Write a protein that binds this ligand. Structure first.
Ligand SMILES: CCCCCCCC(=O)OC[C@@H](O)CO
Ligand SMILES: CCCCCCCC(=O)OC[C@@H](O)CO
Lengths: 244, 244
């Protein structure tokens, strides 16, 4: 089946995001597209895969500054439904009351700051980071628009905006950098396979001290105590394989 | 912008994939949808994140059996363009001749087995596995269809088919299982942060031998030599966090 005005909307937005230049342009276009769907505020959170124990959650938003501060103050992240992929279908999640039954103080606090309606689309990025694009309005008024239309528009928006920010190396999306050589990564592959410094020397046909140097060298770059952190981080973000 | 016959195609296919029951039903529906787009053969490959050194590549296809055997014989995977995410735009990749300049023997071998035209859509799964859905026909004939239509149809097909196979725990998509408890995973979080068995005991307020047991216990389950493999695998597949 085919029927094209959305197909043209798609084409136009792909080009527009590709021809951007600044992270400020990105934020601005989201702010625009949200208003095009009659949403007042937007929001773009990014759950990083690392650190494992205290996951970095970078974000930028045009929310009321008072709300951003309050949300952080009472740490609602720990209970926020819309930042929990389990609640999503097709990477889409509509805001309703029943969704916040376990996080009631967040639900009331958000209303007290003018966030009465909303919606969130999400996507996992090549660096295994979870990107969440949330729209919100202060009007409980009914804005009728086809559900299928909304999903696909946001499906594209959340993707191309974060893909842009990655091409621009923005701090919001960029995982901790680890500029490793091809040999360094080769050594780290086997390290994650559980191979010892001794065994890796045999495979690569090099001195056992040469392996230990590379290992300590990588640790130094990213400031890590042992090879376990280096390898786990490298595996957690897909450096051992896939994209860069 | 909105215009709905595709939106209805979307809705219909979402339900159909959700109400499935067997991995044979999935394969069959792809085979069907490929023929609906005038493609003779399909193919569904899945690059696993682990093992790191010899990445498992499971697949199932209705290709000529002779071709599947030949492709494996001369190991064309190592040079196959259509299974390399770097060549993709919007997770979509059209087959053309210039794409195979570095893999000429594959290009000729594939033609010798009746694969003259094709296309591939790809997607990364929650377990960090890369799923590749390829369609191919034996007719060099021109089948005119809107590019934008093809992309979005396949964008949905590759997703919902692999998401189905995961709900069914199929061997093609399922990463190596590691049924770990909440405490076991808690210990493994810190292990990947580079924390020693001694330090982890201090944080969790438990014996240092208790930590070592959990560690050896996890190793036993997945048959691993040391904690480094357990943690790296657990991080590589997103067990320490995100989905299950
Ligand atoms: C956490 C980013 C700054 C605070 C904005 C909250 C991010 C987000 O979109 O949350 C919306 C819902 O939680 C509403 O309850
Ligand atoms: C590798 C799965 C079995 C062999 C089929 C090849 C998988 C795939 O779709 O490859 C197509 C292109 O490489 C054509 O040159």
């Amino acid at each position: 089946m085919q029927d094209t005005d959305f197909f043209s909307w798609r084409r136009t937005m792909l080009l527009r995001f590709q021809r951007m230049e600044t992270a400020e342009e990105v934020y601005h276009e989201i702010e625009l597209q949200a208003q095009q769907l009659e949403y007042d505020y937007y929001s773009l959170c990014v759950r990083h895969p690392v650190p494992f124990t205290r996951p970095k959650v970078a974000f930028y938003t045009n929310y009321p500054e008072a709300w951003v501060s309050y949300y952080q103050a009472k740490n609602f992240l720990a209970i926020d439904p819309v930042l929990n992929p389990e609640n999503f279908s097709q990477g889409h999640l509509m805001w309703n009351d029943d969704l916040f039954n376990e996080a009631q103080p967040l639900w009331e606090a958000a209303r007290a700051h003018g966030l009465r309606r909303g919606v969130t689309q999400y996507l996992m990025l090549p660096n295994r980071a979870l990107g969440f694009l949330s729209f919100s309005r202060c009007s409980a008024r009914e804005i009728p628009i086809l559900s299928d239309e909304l999903q696909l528009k946001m499906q594209l928006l959340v993707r191309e905006s974060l893909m842009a920010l990655m091409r621009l190396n923005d701090e919001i999306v960029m995982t901790p950098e680890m500029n490793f050589s091809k040999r360094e990564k080769e050594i780290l592959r086997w390290t994650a396979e559980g191979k010892t410094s001794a065994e890796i020397a045999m495979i690569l046909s090099i001195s056992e001290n040469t392996v230990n140097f590379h290992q300590k060298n990588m640790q130094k770059k990213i400031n890590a105590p042992n090879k376990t952190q280096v390898a786990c981080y490298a595996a957690a973000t897909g450096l051992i394989h896939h994209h860069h």
